[model samples]
Target: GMVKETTYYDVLGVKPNATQEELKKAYRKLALKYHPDKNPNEGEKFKQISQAYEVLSDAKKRELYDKGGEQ
Candidate 1:
């Protein structure tokens, strides 16, 4: 099965084929950019990044999400 959603990947600015390491890099970069303290108006944006990374960073979660099963 192919990815049914690109929300997470798009949020982190990465491709579906990105490796865990690459995902982490993207997340860290975006996280800092959106962090609440750094960008007071973007708390929700930061939350999205955190949530997206949480799922994609884990093997089991990533597998389910990749299969379009999480939705």
Candidate 2:
């Protein structure tokens, strides 16, 4: 219901200038670290991480997000 100010880069703990590989690296590690099965009560947080990675890993969506657009 509110505009998301947090960027994917911020969520992934990566710098804005990070490469795709870097983004992927963070996503993979974070996805594992926050997996819902491993942290049942943390499903929402894992969802956020997954959503952030999903958009950031997409070229078009990343471009739109970079330009201040919401996915």
lDDT of 1 by residue, 1-71 (tens): 77656577776889857789998988878878888888899888787788888998778887788777455
Give model 2's TM-score versus the native structure: 0.72
lDDT of 1 at 1: 71
Model 1 lDDT, residue 12, Cα: 80
Give candidate 1 misplaced runs (Cα > 4 Å).
1-5
Most lDDT-accurate candidate: 1
Model 1: lDDT of residue 33: 82
lDDT of each: 0.79, 0.77
Candidate 2: tens digits of C-alpha lDDT, residues 21-61: 99888887887877888977777887777777787777898
